[PDB]
Design a protein around this motif. Structure first.
Motif, PDB file in Angstrom:
ATOM      1  N   UNK A   1     -95.195   7.668  35.554  1.00 33.59           N
ATOM      2  CA  UNK A   1     -94.634   6.440  34.987  1.00 33.59           C
ATOM      3  C   UNK A   1     -93.148   6.745  34.793  1.00 33.59           C
ATOM      4  N   UNK A   2     -92.322   6.274  35.722  1.00 35.04           N
ATOM      5  CA  UNK A   2     -90.940   6.722  35.797  1.00 35.04           C
ATOM      6  C   UNK A   2     -90.071   5.977  34.797  1.00 35.04           C
ATOM      7  N   UNK A   3     -89.001   6.645  34.379  1.00 38.55           N
ATOM      8  CA  UNK A   3     -88.042   6.072  33.451  1.00 38.55           C
ATOM      9  C   UNK A   3     -87.606   7.157  32.493  1.00 38.55           C
ATOM     10  N   UNK A   4     -86.453   7.780  32.749  1.00 36.16           N
ATOM     11  CA  UNK A   4     -86.042   8.931  31.958  1.00 36.16           C
ATOM     12  C   UNK A   4     -85.180   8.575  30.758  1.00 36.16           C
TER      13      UNK A   4
ATOM     14  N   UNK B   1     -82.363   5.478  35.934  1.00 35.93           N
ATOM     15  CA  UNK B   1     -83.648   5.654  35.259  1.00 35.93           C
ATOM     16  C   UNK B   1     -84.487   6.749  35.903  1.00 35.93           C
ATOM     17  N   UNK B   2     -84.366   6.953  37.213  1.00 44.75           N
ATOM     18  CA  UNK B   2     -85.163   7.993  37.865  1.00 44.75           C
ATOM     19  C   UNK B   2     -84.458   9.346  37.835  1.00 44.75           C
ATOM     20  N   UNK B   3     -83.150   9.378  38.091  1.00 49.30           N
ATOM     21  CA  UNK B   3     -82.428  10.635  38.275  1.00 49.30           C
ATOM     22  C   UNK B   3     -81.432  10.954  37.170  1.00 49.30           C
TER      23      UNK B   3
ATOM     24  N   UNK C   1     -90.149  12.641  36.828  1.00 48.09           N
ATOM     25  CA  UNK C   1     -89.707  11.474  37.578  1.00 48.09           C
ATOM     26  C   UNK C   1     -90.101  11.494  39.044  1.00 48.09           C
ATOM     27  N   UNK C   2     -90.821  12.523  39.494  1.00 49.37           N
ATOM     28  CA  UNK C   2     -91.369  12.576  40.842  1.00 49.37           C
ATOM     29  C   UNK C   2     -92.688  13.321  40.776  1.00 49.37           C
TER      30      UNK C   2
ATOM     31  N   UNK D   1     -90.606   1.600  35.082  1.00 48.56           N
ATOM     32  CA  UNK D   1     -91.177   2.216  36.273  1.00 48.56           C
ATOM     33  C   UNK D   1     -90.872   1.356  37.497  1.00 48.56           C
ATOM     34  N   UNK D   2     -90.381   1.935  38.599  1.00 51.36           N
ATOM     35  CA  UNK D   2     -90.041   1.088  39.758  1.00 51.36           C
ATOM     36  C   UNK D   2     -91.208   0.261  40.270  1.00 51.36           C
ATOM     37  N   UNK D   3     -92.412   0.841  40.340  1.00 52.57           N
ATOM     38  CA  UNK D   3     -93.547   0.102  40.883  1.00 52.57           C
ATOM     39  C   UNK D   3     -93.843  -1.129  40.032  1.00 52.57           C
ATOM     40  N   UNK D   4     -93.856  -0.970  38.712  1.00 56.06           N
ATOM     41  CA  UNK D   4     -94.090  -2.180  37.934  1.00 56.06           C
ATOM     42  C   UNK D   4     -92.875  -3.073  37.837  1.00 56.06           C
ATOM     43  N   UNK D   5     -91.668  -2.503  37.876  1.00 56.32           N
ATOM     44  CA  UNK D   5     -90.467  -3.329  37.794  1.00 56.32           C
ATOM     45  C   UNK D   5     -90.399  -4.363  38.911  1.00 56.32           C
ATOM     46  N   UNK D   6     -90.862  -4.027  40.126  1.00 56.65           N
ATOM     47  CA  UNK D   6     -90.751  -4.995  41.222  1.00 56.65           C
ATOM     48  C   UNK D   6     -91.458  -6.303  40.899  1.00 56.65           C
TER      49      UNK D   6
END
Lengths: 156, 156, 156, 156, 156, 156, 156, 156, 156, 156
Positions: free
Chosen positions: F80-83, E102-104, F50-51, H91-96
């Motif tokens: 807001x990550x998620x590609x 999801x990130x890369x 994503x960064x 999003x990793x931050x919300x996914x946790x």
């Protein structure tokens, strides 16, 4: 009949048993429904878990299919209806009727509102029939009749 | 006609524009189809993005609805079919036809194989029509006829 | 020829038992289909729950695989078709054929409408075969032939 | 080509513009591809967002279709592939190819492992074509040839 | 090996039995794979239903784990691959590898196309290994190496 | 940086604009990242939403790509990550990395717990890179290194 | 502990058996955990399939619950975590915690980035507890404390 | 306040505009909430579309952020709540926080029923707080307090 | 009662057995609830796995339905609630209540906020009743009363 | 009225505009419905895109809200009904009514069949209202009345 089901798997498991007995006995759905006083589509649907049979019909088809007493009772229960495994059929024969909705669903809505008004065509006050006819250019066709009450949506 | 679409949104956006024009002119689908020699269900489906009109019909209905030349062309393209927004209808009028598949889908499969054999009833070699009839107990009914060719599944 | 299934798990559980017997006996699908008069893709599909065998072929493959009588009867029933567990394959070998649809699905639509017209290429009046050939660069290729009747979509 | 896309909507929006221009110009995919040296299935796929054209072919079809320079550049970009709106096609023409996978997916897996071994038939080292043939019993058939390299899965 | 599976549950049920025996015997995956000549990631994947073992390795690990003969045969069959219960992992350890996609995921696509060109990095001509290294800041790191063949996409 | 995003479409629309500018200027991701002091995978991920770039790096890549002030600010924002468009990639290049999880996801879990213990390999304290190497048997390979901190799970 | 699970159903089946035994013996989670030296939330999670117990604690709780030897071993295995049946809870008590994510998820993200920076609050370096307190306005409140390490996302 | 929303996109679009203004002005959420008399989590949630501000607070944050009159009014409307794009965060931050539910959801249910009884912990009569604290082991932690009223479930 | 369930299948399997015994004994839900002091909707929900019965009521209904001791205990446990198989009902009788939400869901939200303010109508502090009334136009109607406490959402 | 819609977004976009005008004018739904002769739930539903207003009421509410002529016409069109964005509500206020179905849906089915027989309670011949009452224990309650015609399912 005041008894009803909440888990479709009970009647669907029974349906599988009925289909096995029916195949071993070389019976058709038309033969099973004959003498019940009920339309073949209605009796077939009850065997497949989607309608409830009156007690007399349940005992009759039970005799024809050599069903035990728990099974004859189950056929009289009001079912938890829904025959599609997971919303959209995978089986080509069933899928064609879904595709009919994908192509004509909005046309059916448009023409219902034009001819009847706001509201619905009932799936409850409803009869269906499957008729085999000749195709005048060679082969065979199915004429499937959906016959439902118009129920108006009226202000209050 | 060798031109075809790949994105249903183009024709469905045209459908919304057609419906607004049709509402402003107080037209019915029966009147729009009148003079095409085509069934109301087929012309309506084309307006709603699910069939292609022949050029003669696309100019006739296009004049009635005051459509621009790009829209009359679009109506003649072969569509990317599928009228349901997300697989299962939310609209009650449309949902009832999906509900008849949940209740009778396996009965339709069963009776098709009994009467015809292995194979399908076609959604392509296919006609449908909607008729209003009186209900003898009071009110009105819709008789919807699905008429499709049987295509067999044979060993090879 | 009129008996059909509504729950795919019955024939898919039989498929697992067939595959175990087949592996124990070191049999290929080509050898099992030998002498049936039927194509290997059709017989294989029937073993895997997706076609119905004619009685003579069911008895022949049943003898080769040491199947009981209930299993030989099941293979003759018209199946509830659909071999994919949950709509999209997870298995890489199976997934590549889905990926061909994701890449070329709209191209197939576009070229079918260009060469044939509005309508479909049939998955029912349909033959499939898999052939292994040399890759002129080194290695091997599969040439998979999808042979389907064109069914036109015409106004009514 | 080292440039690539990450959002399929850019090239799919371009595809819709291409299809309108193609319709206005009464052009076929066969004649758009004529002069490129590239197969009609490959050029068509590029127009529909699923392949990248080399610069000379992009300039050629861009002139045929009156595309602006940004669009001619976009056709040379490596796409974010995936032509199906939401995983399973709604369009009947496209759906039949998905149905072939639902019926024969496990047969394709089985015959690939039988003829080649563990591994896959590539969707990358891959080409396809669509041919029209006469059906001896009347009408037309499409012979769609899927031609992919076998890539083995070996222990390491 | 020409035998293959179509229902992942058979080999995944075997994996659960293997894991219980492995825990009772206080065995690691490194020791189970020791003496097979095969990488621990390959042997482990086979035990977990995602690869096929050659006959010699199957008999070796089956001896170590007290597997019956049906199970040793099953480990040799080409699997129906797919280890994730329902498309997206729920387990945190597995989920982190999904999160890296999801990130890369689009960065991996972009850099593959930049360094190699149009095409893919193979998941089939592919090896995987997991190494533990010290973190200079304290603690440990996993260095996971994905080593896949580049397969180009070229015009045809 | 304390500013963060909640709607991924803002940064993903910017990425599309960045990619067009990048293509018009015939730039690589390697040369865009050159002079930032940051790894190409990190800078590329930032361009693709994503960064977050540090301010000096955002201004350097913004100059190379001729981005406006709002765009240079956006690149510094925590995303807001998620590609992935819809959970599972459609693109073949991206899909292969998902397929490695379907085949090896449980093996990665098993080997992580074997070598490190209960817990996870971090996707946060994490570096990745992509290296092109020659294949001794001909062609090229990608060696993709995932380098993550082990975080243990312990009782409390 | 280097042994781990790959199918959550094994430990979730064990959880059901544990809950039956617990009910028959009129035991609380607080008293099951008493004497383990471990927090009730950790021991409870292990019983419910979401943590691994150390050997001494597994033997202790197994004696209280009359667990067989395989069950005591299974409690010590590293689980395949994920307690929600199908992604979103149906149960009202569990659903409220999901609703807090639907209402406050972006606020949690925003405030984490404000106070700490780019990165995450860990779900691994993490503990929680549930406390009952009196509501001054009448009744009772639950104070549920989530306590996780901040792990930064840094450029590389 | 008796005005409410039915389409979350209106307030979520406003949220994006607020975030841009906030970034340009180098403001924190704590700064924005200062002087409102309201907790930072409540004010932040309102900005992000998940709570309604009282008129005085809306006017105050509107001044701080230079919002127009329609925006200040929108912030006072009762929202259509739900901040997650499509049910599960990417999003990793919300996914946790979602993972925290996958690991501990059933433990939270079990401990709530043990300490309080049948019923729920409220997401409505509910306060949320995020506190940054020192990690005694080094670094920083978030202590997130979920403070909800117990509402019992009792027979009627 | 402090004991609770985490797997709904256990109480749902019990429900199926209860329904069979009820049908064999020709009992109504009204009859089963008579003498418990509890509303028919509450007792029926408990039988169907969605509430917990007090011990006295569990023994009374257990004697009426001839349930074993394990079953009488199970009816007293706090359930894992959620009666719908897969989120949306297939059964027409239950679907109509889902359709009322699809048609009136936003109207219920709007009118609740108008009459009460921000917050919810409780599904926990909640009573439900089903009454049969004559339709003055002929036939019968159900008057179904949903009675829930208003819980306000207030700033903090 | 014979004009109907096929894309809910048209009337839902109008609903958003209606809600803005309503808020600017400090209007309630009760007072918008005043003088139309129609129940507040019906008029509110029409404004929110789920019912059609008669011409008189459309002009009357259109004046109160200062709607243009195209908007007043739209309110008279038969809608494409379905107010939930994606099947299950995210908003807590509407979610509670969905939760009522998850807890009591099978109880509603069971009691309907017991009091009426096989069939449904109509969502078409149907009215609802929301009443605010005192909670005798303190606070306020909503009494929501669902009043639907019983439609029987009879054999045919």
């Amino acid at each position: 009949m005041i008894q009803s089901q909440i888990n479709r798997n009970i009647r669907l498991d029974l349906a599988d048993a009925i289909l096995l007995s029916k195949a071993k006995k070389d019976l058709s759905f038309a033969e099973i429904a004959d003498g019940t006083g009920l339309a073949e589509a209605f009796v077939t649907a009850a065997l497949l878990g989607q309608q409830a049979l009156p007690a007399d019909a349940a005992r009759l088809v039970g005799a024809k299919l050599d069903l035990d007493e728990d099974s004859i009772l189950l056929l009289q229960m009001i079912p938890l209806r829904g025959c599609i495994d997971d919303r959209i059929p995978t089986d080509p024969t069933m899928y064609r009727f879904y595709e009919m909705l994908q192509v004509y669903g909005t046309t059916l809505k448009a023409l219902v509102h034009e001819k009847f008004g706001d509201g619905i065509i009932s799936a409850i006050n409803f009869k269906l029939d499957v008729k085999k006819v000749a195709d005048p250019e060679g082969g065979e066709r199915a004429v499937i009749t959906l016959d439902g009450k118009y129920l108006p949506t009226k202000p209050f």
